[PDB]
Amino acid sequence: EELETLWLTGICSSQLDIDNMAGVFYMLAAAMALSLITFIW
Amino acid sequence: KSTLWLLVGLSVHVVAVMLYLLDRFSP
């Protein structure tokens, strides 16, 4: 374990919301779809 | 010792147009 410690070292924060914004666009498309449902009466 | 906000702005540009469309459509 000491020699593996000496000779090995096993190494290895930002904004992204493309899934949340994809849900945003899907829910607003569903909202205008519900408006289109209410349009036919 | 950003671009997604511009996408949201284009989205609300769509929103205002479709709200005026529902204003004209719905009695």
Side-chain angles (χ1 to χ4, degrees):
Chain A
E1 181 66 29
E2 183 180 2
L3 289 177
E4 290 181 353
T5 304
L6 181 61
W7 294 102
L8 295 172
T9 301
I11 64 170
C12 68
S13 65
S14 295
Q15 57 182 357
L16 72 163
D17 53 356
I18 58 171
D19 185 74
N20 297 114
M21 291 179 72
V24 164
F25 283 107
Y26 290 161
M27 289 299 291
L28 64 89
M32 66 183 71
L34 292 176
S35 73
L36 193 147
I37 292 169
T38 60
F39 282 162
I40 63 171
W41 184 257
Chain B
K1 294 181 182 179
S2 297
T3 305
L4 300 172
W5 180 69
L6 185 64
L7 185 62
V8 171
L10 296 175
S11 297
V12 74
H13 286 90
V14 175
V15 167
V17 174
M18 70 180 182
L19 285 173
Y20 182 73
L21 288 173
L22 198 147
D23 181 75
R24 184 175 290 172
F25 284 164
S26 65

